[PDB]
Design a protein around this nucleic acid. Structure first.
Lengths: 173, 159, 190, 78, 205
RNA sequence: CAAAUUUAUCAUAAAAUAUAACUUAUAGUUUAUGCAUUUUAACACAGAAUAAAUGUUAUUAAUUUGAUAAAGUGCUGAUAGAUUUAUAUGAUUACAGUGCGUUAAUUUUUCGGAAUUAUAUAAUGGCAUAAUUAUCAUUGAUUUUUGUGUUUAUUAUAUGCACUUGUAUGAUUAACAAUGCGAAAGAUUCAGGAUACCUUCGGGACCCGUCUUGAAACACGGACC
RNA sequence: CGUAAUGUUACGUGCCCAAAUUAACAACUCAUGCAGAUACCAUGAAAGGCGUUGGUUGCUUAAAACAGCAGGACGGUGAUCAUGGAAGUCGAAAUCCGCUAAGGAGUGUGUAACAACUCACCUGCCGAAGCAACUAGCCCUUAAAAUGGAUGGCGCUUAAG
RNA sequence: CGGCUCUUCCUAUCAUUGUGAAGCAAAAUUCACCAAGCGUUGGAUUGUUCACCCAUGCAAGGGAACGUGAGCUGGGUUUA
RNA sequence: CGCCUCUAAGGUCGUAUCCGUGCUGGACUGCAAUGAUAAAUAAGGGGCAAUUUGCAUUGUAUGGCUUCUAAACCAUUUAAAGUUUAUAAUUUACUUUAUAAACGACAAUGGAUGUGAUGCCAAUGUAAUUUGUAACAUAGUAAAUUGGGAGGAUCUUCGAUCACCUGAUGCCGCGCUAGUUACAUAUAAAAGCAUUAUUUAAUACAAUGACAAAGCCUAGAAUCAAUUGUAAACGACUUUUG
């Protein structure tokens, strides 16, 4: 889907020998909240003990990008499983939302490295400014004043007329 | 230059195929090579991204900073006199004739088949006996030069 | 990664009249004129009414923006090839048998014979617009000269690929006509 | 498109064609019953491109494929 | 005079990829079509020339051993290359698709009324919309000259006759409507049925 | 439900760029290639002023943009179907609606009109406590059985008699209208019919018996009656 | 899995063929004799590619490098190793010396042995990124059978992979 | 089973065409590339099939339908 | 990738291969050019018919009448190409060049630009019987006949190929538009107020058809049998027959 972010919090439900277990939290990227509560458990089983059934899910809440029309570069610290292959990457994308950059990373890994998405762990996701990005296909856009003439449109198929009388003509003037 | 569609600020482009189809956005920043950040304050467009497929670029370029908020963009449409310029622009006229031709009530349809028929009768009459191969001569002079005598003489009839 | 813009601007001198139209660069100088159609190439080519000629590319891959300096040196060959011209000079080296090279008026061709004591008379036609001659004041030498560098240099190497020596050791039978100095006609020397 | 093929949804269709012989008279207009017809309704649409689905009284013989069916403008909505 | 929408659609084959036109035609002909494709020497194939030449020469190698006269006949004209593509996208062993193939005329180089008729394009088959700048392409007229079709330069001379007949029928029809533009100032005082009523379409018409 | 970005809003704000003063620079150029004029899509995120310049600081209204949820929410346009021999051996059952109905105020368009308020009983909420029971956390909050008034809201019961083309017809399908008369012997109208075919077309479609894990089998048998 | 009518469903939607050449996108890939095209499944590896795409580590760098046009590279000496033979050099126990802005007892087909020469050093102009090593996407390569031939067929290349 | 006859196909290339490379001077050869168009024989011994022998030959490659018995032959094998 | 480099575009040399030519067959039976065109002369065949008729049916045309687009985008080039017009220079040719504007793949254009500027209509009757009768400013248009040149042929809907067309000869000298404004005249109501019904055709335009229907023109071949022997199993084949 489109992969919005959440904060899933978990406990280890306190048998009376232990009062008030220490409450870890996350930043999970997921299509929906039913799948964010098995990405919490997948990532925490690497880190602390307490699986489910022996833990609780305290509040999972969605976080709503704090500037949806400001324009910023997102660096994603990733690690994935290739065919021979656990690696780390640091990818950079350019977007407005932070769930929209993570989802622009889950396609790119599928395109470029064949990476079906169960292999990708996300470490960190930031909003790095500029003159901290490196990633030359993102530094293309870090200059006012940028021009680029367009060549891009739609060319309906068949059309509102399949057998046209007047030739689309990719160019004019 | 040949100068194709410049993606700038603030090159006014009219949207073309999306949910904003028909409205005139400005362009304030370029997200990536495929998407810009469109914002038309005087035309019912809040600031939002847009895919550059569904945009068609006009010839107007207003001036604001590349990181401006919507009030600076709205201030610059007015100073350019862009609304008065756009509706008299060479083929925004052409937009509204297709909008006029669009879907065209049944009385207006069959009124034009009547009104084009009558000037078409007036236009096949103003047609096609030029200098070519008359004068001289056109024999017999009485009858195959009967009708054009009223173009020539004009009075009255050969005669 | 589909670079946005790659461009190169060719300075054109005071006399010759370059005029790119629809991509086809024609150019016209003292020693004649030359048109080359670059329309295999999907590139900008416009002359911004200065002396200069600009060539641009929008969103080309990594290969596609190698052809910017290619075409901006094909035009820079043309501003020589109509002003200074080209003149190659291949020098006809032999061991025992002399090399006989006959051209006449105006007989653009060549007949190149006695190689290597062989009866067969190699005859090869120069391209349109290029004249071959025997070099006066330095004999046993040819002078291939014309306007277009791809029709001069294809006309030298047509007669360098024949004469060629077969079934022998080609490190020992160093015989043939090999290009000494690829040069321009009028500036400075020849 | 879908919006275009749904105008015709509800309306009455006909496959009209020719035979020769009656087993009838000029009771009504003056016929050898020398033109047949098989009526039907458009029931719904088919793809995303304005095709449609029809349900005739008899069944449409199949050598009718390619031939003209007529979308009567009634049962008339707006 | 007639056709199931108009007389026949005459598609100019100039600038159109062969298989993206052969499928919209084969679909249209199974719906009741009547098309004609003219200039079949000008259709395109994607990829460079030798890549397609290879594909055709391998097609020429298929032939029945116990009789080559039974075998796959390898028609070499650019129109009967296009008919080969359309015949594969038709069921041609049913009567439905064999009648669908009978509504198909294909021509190397535009004769006999389809030269004064009306040429429509199919903008989804058109090469300049689909392929890329720096992909390579060929024509079927070059492919057919290199494989055994003898009339490449018959139909180049035949066509510039036809393209010089059109040089004067565009010289007449450009001066013959210097008078229709003349006549539309002598009927300016019509009554007023142009002056207002065709401000329904109405700034240009 | 966060979002104080959207929007406008204050505060010293200091920036990650546009607007008014301009040196050079290629310039088909001007005159004597400087300038003159362009190019700014060489213009120095250079000089002066101004432009939230990023959020920093502020609070918010189109309830606070979207998403999720709920309310016969409501409306519109369709499609297909409609057992039913209400006794060839058990009520057309009950519900509900419409027609004459003491009044008196208060309004309403002003028409046979229409609305409201006024009657007891029984509840139920909202509110104000006083109990009580029992629990996340306990400054309090939630909760069970109550009580009584304070109260302000909402439902229910109090519609009998006669009549009628208003639901379940106790798997409801029932109406208006068009066409067509089952002629004394015999026409016609409408619908239907692989009767054994023939015509036409699209889909399907291997040859049966058999033994076999597996048969259309290049397994065996079978030319036909 | 009774016999029917209607509606809704994993495999698919360029044409065969019902349904997208999707007013839905981001990439990847050019395959000259099978580019590639859906599980099982109708084979293909090891090892490579300054083919292109992404990524990881380390150096040089806005002390002016990288590249290139412009300099030297001989020698304190055939120390020895050594006679195809080592005079700047097969091998090589061994190993210590020029000069400054700046020159190698120096790797070599074998230049019989010598010479030179030039990929270091460093003065340049250049004045901006350069250098390698490594990784795994696709394509290529590796990749050879006999009737004519099979992504099912056509045909596809800002795809119809 | 072989041989005889006759046709087609493969390339894992012997030769020839066009080439690249050698420790390629010429001659002769070797290695490799594109490449299946034409060619790849006569005998002695054995039923053979490979290998060997005489010889010619510029040069004497390897295989496919277990190719081929209502095509033959019947030597091998294999009934009495 | 400042140099270098056969490669990335783009050029090139080039095999006993490949594909053609030449050669051999020919969709059985494909196609094109061409020749003659009957049993005649009493009488009837055969065209030329489209004019020839009533007649009857056909197709389009469905209650005028739910149409044409046989007028158009150029040839080759092309994803910064690719476009127009204008003007001053120029063509064998919107020849090529120089300035200046215009939408610099808008909505546009995907249909109508109706691309010789379309029609379900002129007729002021627009349709299952219908037709139309005068004045004031515009407008000047389609019209039938016999002896010369320039032009038109891509596996065909009529080739003693021929449609703008030299100067000649005479007419119906007929029918005519558009507009304001006036008048006569005539047809039209299908019976149903859930007017949908056989869902059609008197309409017009093109086409055959048979029974009595007017003329113009026409006057053959093939095969068998016999023969040959350039051929041959038999057919077939090459031949010959006042």
């Amino acid at each position: 889907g489109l992969l919005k972010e959440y904060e899933v919090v978990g406990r280890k439900l306190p048998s009376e020998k232990e009062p008030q277990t220490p409450l870890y939290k996350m930043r999970i990227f997921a299509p929906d909240n039913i799948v964010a509560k098995s990405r919490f458990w997948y990532f925490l089983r690497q880190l602390k003990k307490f699986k489910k059934t022996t833990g609780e899910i305290v509040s999972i809440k969605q976080v709503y990008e704090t500037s949806p029309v400001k324009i910023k570069n997102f660096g994603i610290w990733l690690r994935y499983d290739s065919r021979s292959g656990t690696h780390n990457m640091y990818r950079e994308y350019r977007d407005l939302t932070v769930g929209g950059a993570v989802t622009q990373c889950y396609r790119d890994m599928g395109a470029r490295h064949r990476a079906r998405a169960h292999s990708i762990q996300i470490i960190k996701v930031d909003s790095i400014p500029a003159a901290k990005t490196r990633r030359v296909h993102v530094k293309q856009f870090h200059d006012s004043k940028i021009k680029f003439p367009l060549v891009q449109r739609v060319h309906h198929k068949g059309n509102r007329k399949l057998f046209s009388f007047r030739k689309p003509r990719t160019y004019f003037q | 230059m040949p100068f194709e569609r410049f993606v700038q600020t603030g090159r006014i482009a009219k949207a073309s195929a999306g949910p904003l189809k028909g409205r005139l956005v400005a362009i304030v920043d370029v997200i990536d090579q495929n998407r810009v950040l469109v914002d038309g304050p005087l035309t019912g467009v809040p600031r939002q991204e847009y895919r550059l497929n569904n945009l068609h670029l006009t010839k107007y370029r207003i001036k604001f900073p590349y990181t401006a908020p919507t009030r600076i963009v709205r201030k610059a449409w007015t100073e350019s006199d862009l609304k008065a310029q756009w509706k008299v622009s060479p083929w925004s006229v052409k937009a509204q004739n297709i909008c006029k031709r669009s879907s065209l009530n049944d009385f207006d349809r069959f009124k034009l088949r009547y009104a084009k028929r009558q000037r078409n009768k007036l236009l096949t009459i103003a047609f096609n006996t030029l200098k070519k191969r008359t004068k001289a001569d056109g024999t017999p002079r009485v009858l195959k030069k009967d009708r054009r005598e009223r173009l020539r003489a004009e009075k009255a009839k050969g005669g | 990664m589909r670079t946005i813009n790659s461009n190169q601007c060719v300075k054109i001198p005071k006399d010759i009249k370059a005029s790119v139209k629809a991509r086809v660069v024609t150019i016209t100088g003292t020693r004649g004129t030359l048109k080359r159609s670059f329309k295999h190439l999907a590139l900008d080519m416009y002359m911004p009414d200065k002396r200069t000629l600009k060539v641009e590319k929008w969103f080309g891959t990594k290969k596609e923006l190698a052809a910017v300096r290619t075409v901006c040196s094909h035009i820079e060959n043309m501003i020589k090839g109509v002003t200074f011209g080209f003149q190659y000079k291949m020098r006809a080296v032999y061991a025992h048998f002399p090399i006989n090279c006959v051209t006449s008026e105006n007989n653009t061709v060549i007949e190149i014979r006695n190689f290597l004591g062989e009866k067969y008379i190699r005859r090869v036609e120069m391209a349109p617009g290029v004249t071959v001659v025997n070099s006066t004041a330095q004999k046993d030498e040819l002078i291939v000269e014309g306007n277009d560098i791809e029709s001069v240099s294809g006309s030298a190497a047509l007669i360098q690929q024949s004469t060629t020596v077969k079934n022998k050791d080609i490190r020992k039978f160093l015989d043939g006509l090999y290009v000494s100095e690829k040069t321009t006609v009028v500036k400075l020397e020849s | 498109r879908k919006e275009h093929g749904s105008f015709y949804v509800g309306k009455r269709c006909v496959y009209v064609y020719k035979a020769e012989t009656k087993k009838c008279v000029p009771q009504h207009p003056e016929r050898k019953t020398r033109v047949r017809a098989v009526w039907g309704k458009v029931t719904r649409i088919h793809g995303n491109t304005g095709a449609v689905r029809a349900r005739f009284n008899r069944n449409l013989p199949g050598h009718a494929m390619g031939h003209r069916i007529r979308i009567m403008l009634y049962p008339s909505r707006i | 005079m007639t056709g199931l929408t108009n007389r026949t659609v005459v598609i100019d084959g100039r600038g159109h990829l062969l298989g993206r036109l052969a499928s919209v035609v084969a679909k249209y002909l199974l719906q009741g079509g009547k098309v004609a494709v003219v200039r079949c020497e000008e259709l395109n194939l994607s990829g460079h020339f030798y890549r397609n030449k290879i594909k055709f020469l391998a097609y020429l190698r298929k032939r029945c051993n116990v009789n080559p006269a039974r075998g796959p006949f390898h028609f070499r004209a650019p129109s009967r290359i296009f008919y080969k593509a359309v015949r594969g996208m038709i069921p041609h062993k049913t009567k439905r698709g064999q009648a669908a193939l009978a509504r198909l005329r294909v021509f190397d180089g535009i004769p006999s009324p389809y030269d004064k008729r009306r040429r429509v394009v199919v903008p989804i088959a058109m090469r300049v919309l689909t392929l890329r700048s720096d992909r390579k392409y060929c024509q079927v007229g070059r492919l057919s000259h290199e494989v055994g079709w003898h009339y490449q330069d018959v139909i180049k001379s035949l066509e510039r006759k036809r393209k010089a007949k059109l040089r004067v029928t565009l010289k007449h029809n450009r001066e013959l409507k210097k008078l229709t533009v003349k006549a539309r100032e002598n009927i300016a005082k019509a009554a007023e049925p142009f002056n207002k009523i065709i401000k329904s379409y109405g700034y240009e018409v």
